[PDB]
Amino acid sequence: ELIVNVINGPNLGRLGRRGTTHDELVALIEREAAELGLKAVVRQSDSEAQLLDWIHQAADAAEPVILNAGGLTHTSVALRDACAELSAPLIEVHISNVHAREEFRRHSYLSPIATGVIVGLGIQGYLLALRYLAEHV
Amino acid sequence: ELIVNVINGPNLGRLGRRGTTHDELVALIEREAAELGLKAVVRQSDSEAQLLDWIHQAADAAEPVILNAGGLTHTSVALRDACAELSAPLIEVHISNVHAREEFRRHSYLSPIATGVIVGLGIQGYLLALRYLAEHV
Amino acid sequence: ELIVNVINGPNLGRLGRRGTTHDELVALIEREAAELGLKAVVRQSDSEAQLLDWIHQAADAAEPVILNAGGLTHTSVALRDACAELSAPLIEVHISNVHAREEFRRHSYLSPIATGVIVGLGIQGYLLALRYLAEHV
Amino acid sequence: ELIVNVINGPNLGRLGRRGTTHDELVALIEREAAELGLKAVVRQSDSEAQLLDWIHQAADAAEPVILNAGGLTHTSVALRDACAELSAPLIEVHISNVHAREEFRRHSYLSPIATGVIVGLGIQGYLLALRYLAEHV
Amino acid sequence: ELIVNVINGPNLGRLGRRGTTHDELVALIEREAAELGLKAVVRQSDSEAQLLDWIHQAADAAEPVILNAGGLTHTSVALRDACAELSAPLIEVHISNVHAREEFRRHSYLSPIATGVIVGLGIQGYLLALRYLAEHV
Amino acid sequence: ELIVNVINGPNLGRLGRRGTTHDELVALIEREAAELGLKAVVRQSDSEAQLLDWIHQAADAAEPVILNAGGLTHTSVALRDACAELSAPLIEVHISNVHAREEFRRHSYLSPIATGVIVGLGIQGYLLALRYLAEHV
Amino acid sequence: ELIVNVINGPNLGRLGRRGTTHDELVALIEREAAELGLKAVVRQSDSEAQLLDWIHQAADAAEPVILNAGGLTHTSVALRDACAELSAPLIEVHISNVHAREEFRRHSYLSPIATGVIVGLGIQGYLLALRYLAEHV
Amino acid sequence: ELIVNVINGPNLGRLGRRGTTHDELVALIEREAAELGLKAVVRQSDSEAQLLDWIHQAADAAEPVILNAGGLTHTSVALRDACAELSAPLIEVHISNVHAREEFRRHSYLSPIATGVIVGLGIQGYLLALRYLAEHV
Amino acid sequence: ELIVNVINGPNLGRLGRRGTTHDELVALIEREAAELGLKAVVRQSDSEAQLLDWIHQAADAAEPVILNAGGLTHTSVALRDACAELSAPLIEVHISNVHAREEFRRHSYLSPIATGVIVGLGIQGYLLALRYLAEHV
Amino acid sequence: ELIVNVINGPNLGRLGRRGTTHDELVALIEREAAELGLKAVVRQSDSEAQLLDWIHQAADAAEPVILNAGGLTHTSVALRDACAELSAPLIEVHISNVHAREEFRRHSYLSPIATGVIVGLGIQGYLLALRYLAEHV
Amino acid sequence: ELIVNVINGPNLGRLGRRGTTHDELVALIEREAAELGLKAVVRQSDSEAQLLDWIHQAADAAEPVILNAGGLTHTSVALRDACAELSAPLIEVHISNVHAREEFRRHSYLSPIATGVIVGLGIQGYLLALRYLAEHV
Amino acid sequence: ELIVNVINGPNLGRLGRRGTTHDELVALIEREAAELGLKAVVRQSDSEAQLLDWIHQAADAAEPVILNAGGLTHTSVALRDACAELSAPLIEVHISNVHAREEFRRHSYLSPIATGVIVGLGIQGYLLALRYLAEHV
Numbered sequence A, B, C, D, E, F, G, H, I, J, K, L: 001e002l003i004v005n006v007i008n009g010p011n012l013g014r015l016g017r018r019g020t021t022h023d024e025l026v027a028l029i030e031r032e033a034a035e036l037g038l039k040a041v042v043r044q045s046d047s048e049a050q051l052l053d054w055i056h057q058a059a060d061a062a063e064p065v066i067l068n069a070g071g072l073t074h075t076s077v078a079l080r081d082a083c084a085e086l087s088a089p090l091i092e093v094h095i096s097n098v099h100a101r102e103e104f105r106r107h108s109y110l111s112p113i114a115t116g117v118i119v120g121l122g123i124q125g126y127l128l129a130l131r132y133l134a135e136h137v
């Protein structure tokens, strides 16, 4: 199927003063998706409720999700539970290597329900997640 | 007093694809409340802030609350603290038996401040909570 | 610099039925700030996303922050991460002595990134935080 | 006919700090109406213009009105004139015995155009007004 | 000057079920004004505050006012006081002969500050008020 | 307590064409309040319903009120009744000496429930009311 | 009575690229109405629901209607039924001679309930409909 | 299941000047539904698009529908097609006996896809449709 | 010219529960358009008035239209008439073979004014319509 | 053609404290237009963008324009360029004799593209511009 | 009089990346005003129309204005003309020494109508303008 | 970097009646950008303030700008000053050869601060500006 949802959570709108901005990340993702024959829909919110609604829509549409949940990765049971309804693949992405950072960042509520997880590969992590989904149609 | 607040948290709007829908649950609750001589006000949100506001209103009105907080049961100190202001009974309800599921679901921030807790009895749990409140006027 | 942000999180709007109201707290802070030659901007929200936006603005303006995050003190990685972007001082304040209360309240995601922390001194804690910032220009 | 309008004027939203709240009053009225085979539509406003619009709608629908106009009972010719257009019964209700209070409260612009008046019987006054209308179909 | 304000108060929107409707009254006034070389601006509200704002605008513009205040004729000091600021003529109009009706309708807060008063001549009263203003330029 | 509410009713927005404007009056009040160690919150409306809501808020906050109700002084039972709920002092102020004017202005629905009344001292009346409240803490 | 409603349906906003524009048509109608001692209220919509609401208002006001329903002439039972409630005359107008065009345009749901019908006389058809209504008062 | 949707189309808001009003019809339906152990959700629109959305929601919820489509009964393929998605029963209702009226009213796009059809039994037709659905659970 | 409008009418938003969703259809169209050197603007509405406005815009821009009008294909003269203003090609598309279905679906108000018509080729019908327009520049 | 646009730019809303107000000017223009068999549409804005939009509409409608651009007369190339699209006459009007004032006011970006220019004849300048257009049909 | 308007034009919201921010400038001005016994109202816009409205309000209130018009200093006749209506002092301020910069910045439309002008003294220029107005009451 | 801003000023929305429309220009730019590996964000406004905000965003994002400012090219110091904050390249584009037209069009406030300028090459000028930026990364 063509459509892949890329959903970014809290503080990811701040990319590029936290070099690559979130707008630039959207552009990079869109270009790579077109190359792969996909259509990427990229969304970012600091609101858990908004993220939940986007995940609910992806469940109702049976669309795959690439999710970088920011701080809610480590803290939100609610976001996990929304993701548990997804029928298509869920790929967890983090820009930083969360396993090399504070202890609290080494625990994810999403990893057990995700198909797979990419961390520490920068923004290329998103592009690699897209290529997985393209080669897994 | 006639009025009981029934407040549902994250992902409870998704009932009936997660058979009984949330609209149907509202109908069942309303019917049982009328039978018991009560009026039930049933509300659902995926927003912690919205849930907090509803709990604040119930505190200011000295109205009892039946609360199924969804994932925030396990995670939100803020929701607990809002519930601590309530003067009337607080009944915690979960549809599933949270004690039979993942370890993280066996811990609730609400149970220590609730009057009581019903889990694992399905949607009938709400109806049983209503009957407690009716027989405790 | 003149401006200091005072940001209150969940349930702090309920001060004075939880004697001093939040409006009164704003007045007290404003008066003390004028005495110190500062301008205080006091804001309160029960919404994590709203708190994040206010912290983002303070980062972009290089303004100091006095933050009483309420229940999110103990639970929100996202709020921590927003505060990590601040270049000016961050002073954590709690009205109650959180170290004398439930175990879960003795852990803060903010303390490790804050300049300093004041707890248990009541509403005067805010005024003392302001005086620190004034004497540290 | 099934429908009865119950219209409350200024300060009646403050019931229960001025024990029974306005929400509770609505619940009590609704329950009694169902028992009587009626449907009660209960509305409250501190705005004369809003009350006038509700009375205008009841005139256009030929629906009966139970009206507790609050302070406007004693002061508003405009509200009287709107009520003069009603074709169905108008029942004036006051919770307090207005004849036992200040002199200005013993004069009503509505009493001369009302079918009848109940005062001093508490919130039961509304329920008794409903029973009149039910037995007068 | 060309412009005359015609301002109708409470219950005057109900003309023609209380034969001529308020829309028809506007049409009649507009036609007569054009014949007289004037421009009539006709407005109606059940809101005292709205009437006050229209009178305030006419004061700031030094425009004459034809005012049929409905029930507020007999009751509103506030409307009187707004009219006291007018520099151009104020003509009070009532469709019915208020002196032939209930005692309370025979007292007007506006008559002492009006240039003159027309009552009991029907809707033609407005047209006669316009002709006064035209012949008094 | 720091906060005092100053509430102006109908036509008081027109000050300074009815020299000192309402904006200027707000400035004068704010300055005097700061001198006295108070915070003044000054509001004006031509809407009775809006005034009622502001008085309701002051009742719920146990804050004192300085009220110049304009024409509603003489006419509104509803405004009186809202003021009767206040627990802190109510000071009635009029700029003009109402006892030297028309007979209808010599009767107030508010005076019997007010702590005290200042009339005829101009805009300084407000400043004197503030000084009373400051010396009565 | 002065008021006549002129109601245009789908595609009539496109006049003057489909020479005379709809704005110009409104102007022509208004001028002719003034000459005849009438007031014309001219409205156009591509929305059936909006047309229905305008017809409902004309029924409640007992005002005559000149209706050029565009394509809905041939297709809408709902519009017919709304027009059946009118007590004053209904004049059907079409700019083009619908009887000289496609077969489907030679059938109207409105003609059987209209007083009369004018087709093929251009925009003058509206002006002639107005003159009928003026001479039939 | 408890919930039944009752959907009324064009001109059904005009009931009771076209004796029983639409508000009264809602009341009658609600009462009968409660007696039968159901919950009725009654909606009316003159907009085809709005009716389509309500039918779409009933399809997604697998809820039964009682539909009186007004004039669109005879004309709308789109409404038919929306109803074809319903999995629960569809009961077509008309207040009037459409088979005794104009020829065009004797053809329905909905009858072939409806479970059954009630016509000519007045407003009781709705109540009888509800009783069918209750006895067919 | 680059731009082609693809306009879908009633019930086409329901694709993929009526496998391919409307979002997916948009993606497929966009990709094929880019391959052909075109830009496709894809819009869907259940509102006739909205469809009319989109067709009006395409007329004013002299842009070609691919139109799948859903049920309005068979019923709307208004939509036909809007399409008659188009100067660029109009291609009618239906996913299903309408000639193999109910008799009423074998009649189209659009076919006589369309350049051409594709039916029964699924969603590929849209892509084939795009390729026609690209090879006809 | 009947319609003439009269467009006023910055500071022209302030007429009558800068005797005749802008409202009065509108009235005078409307009356003169009716006498001449025209319809005048009079608009005023302090926003260049708003003026541009009004000129764009007049270009699309092939309607004549009487333009008093205020200060933008001397400064705005953008307004000139919008006026260059007009096909019907453009008449430039100024109330004051701009040639007798500061040097900067003696240069207009509009005069070279206008049909003609009237200055220094007061508000009658507009009426004379209207009479030109009427006699030039 | 207490009130002074401080109005900033285009690009002045960008202060502190173009050290002192606009928020900080507001704070500095407010503090200095309080010291001088004044109340400063500080506003900034990139919209000429918005600046014009603020100047219009200051004219109607007979309040003094400190104006740093940004680029419109050199270009806007409209802003000049609005300022010409002011009866109280107008003080022109620029942060930079405009006489040391490009030739076009050495010409101001405002200087000839201003009381006086301060340039090149930084943000202190505003504070010095305030002190002028305070010593000139 | 991928993103380039293309910003069009006054009257550029009117392209294609002033053959290629603004929508078509957007399409052409988008296609060329994709070919070059860029993402173009194309915006048009007749509002100087809106253009300023878009330039401010591009400054904060360190994104390059292709700017065709329309008439403001020749007149706006404010727009120049906003562009002076840009750190990435600024390319000035005009469709027409401004040096062959009126004298006032041969002067630009933007040229001295732009990297470079393209005029007179039609809409291809934008595409050539994009190719510069792509080859200058």
Ligand SMILES: O=C(O)[C@]1(O)C/C(=N\O)[C@@H](O)[C@H](O)C1
Pocket: A009, A010, A011, A012, A068, A069, A070, A071, A072, A073, A093, A094, A095, A096, A097, A098, A105, C077, C078, C081
């Ligand atoms: O490295 C990442 O992508 C992160 O998701 C960014 C975060 N917030 O935006 C973190 O909280 C996190 O642990 C890692």
Ligand SMILES: O=C(O)[C@]1(O)C/C(=N\O)[C@@H](O)[C@H](O)C1
Pocket: A077, A078, A081, B009, B010, B011, B012, B068, B069, B070, B071, B072, B073, B093, B094, B095, B096, B097, B098, B105
């Ligand atoms: O079983 C329940 O009712 C739950 O509250 C549902 C949840 N979210 O909606 C859970 O997160 C939960 O643990 C149990």
Ligand SMILES: O=C(O)[C@]1(O)C/C(=N\O)[C@@H](O)[C@H](O)C1
Pocket: B077, B078, B081, C009, C010, C011, C012, C068, C069, C070, C071, C072, C073, C093, C094, C095, C096, C097, C098, C105
């Ligand atoms: O004592 C405080 O100031 C607290 O921040 C208040 C809280 N919510 O408003 C707490 O959750 C907390 O632990 C302490």
Ligand SMILES: O=C(O)[C@]1(O)C/C(=N\O)[C@@H](O)[C@H](O)C1
Pocket: D009, D010, D011, D012, D068, D069, D070, D071, D072, D073, D093, D094, D095, D096, D097, D098, D105, F077, F078, F081
């Ligand atoms: O007793 C009552 O019900 C009253 O209507 C309440 C009032 N306001 O809410 C009064 O002003 C009144 O006289 C009595």
Ligand SMILES: O=C(O)[C@]1(O)C/C(=N\O)[C@@H](O)[C@H](O)C1
Pocket: D077, D078, D081, E009, E010, E011, E012, E068, E069, E070, E071, E072, E073, E093, E094, E095, E096, E097, E098, E105
């Ligand atoms: O006769 C009139 O015109 C009146 O103003 C109508 C009223 N309300 O609309 C009255 O209250 C009145 O006394 C007379």
Ligand SMILES: O=C(O)[C@]1(O)C/C(=N\O)[C@@H](O)[C@H](O)C1
Pocket: E077, E078, E081, F009, F010, F011, F012, F068, F069, F070, F071, F072, F073, F093, F094, F095, F096, F097, F098, F105
């Ligand atoms: O003198 C005053 O302050 C007054 O309150 C002003 C009024 N309206 O604004 C009056 O109606 C009044 O009697 C006195």
Ligand SMILES: O=C(O)[C@]1(O)C/C(=N\O)[C@@H](O)[C@H](O)C1
Pocket: G009, G010, G011, G012, G068, G069, G070, G071, G072, G073, G093, G094, G095, G096, G097, G098, G105, I077, I078, I081
């Ligand atoms: O000729 C007319 O006036 C028409 O009503 C115009 C139409 N739409 O605007 C038609 O559909 C029609 O048949 C005739």
Ligand SMILES: O=C(O)[C@]1(O)C/C(=N\O)[C@@H](O)[C@H](O)C1
Pocket: G077, G078, G081, H009, H010, H011, H012, H068, H069, H070, H071, H072, H073, H093, H094, H095, H096, H097, H098, H105
């Ligand atoms: O009799 C009915 O219920 C009808 O549905 C009412 C209609 N519109 O509201 C008709 O168009 C119809 O044929 C019958």
Ligand SMILES: O=C(O)[C@]1(O)C/C(=N\O)[C@@H](O)[C@H](O)C1
Pocket: H077, H078, H081, I009, I010, I011, I012, I068, I069, I070, I071, I072, I073, I093, I094, I095, I096, I097, I098, I105
């Ligand atoms: O097959 C199609 O594409 C159709 O247009 C779909 C419809 N509604 O969405 C029909 O009403 C139709 O006849 C065919």
Ligand SMILES: O=C(O)[C@]1(O)C/C(=N\O)[C@@H](O)[C@H](O)C1
Pocket: J009, J010, J011, J012, J068, J069, J070, J071, J072, J073, J093, J094, J095, J096, J097, J098, J105, K077, K078, K081
């Ligand atoms: O005299 C006029 O009509 C003017 O257009 C008024 C102005 N602004 O409203 C001027 O700027 C002008 O030069 C003349």
Ligand SMILES: O=C(O)[C@]1(O)C/C(=N\O)[C@@H](O)[C@H](O)C1
Pocket: K009, K010, K011, K012, K068, K069, K070, K071, K072, K073, K093, K094, K095, K096, K097, K098, K105, L077, L078, L081
């Ligand atoms: O130096 C100043 O304060 C200026 O007003 C700032 C400007 N825009 O914000 C200029 O255009 C200017 O010439 C000087």
Ligand SMILES: O=C(O)[C@]1(O)C/C(=N\O)[C@@H](O)[C@H](O)C1
Pocket: J077, J078, J081, L009, L010, L011, L012, L068, L069, L070, L071, L072, L073, L093, L094, L095, L096, L097, L098, L105
């Ligand atoms: O030729 C161009 O692109 C121009 O920028 C268009 C204009 N407005 O849209 C002009 O004012 C201009 O001089 C040239």
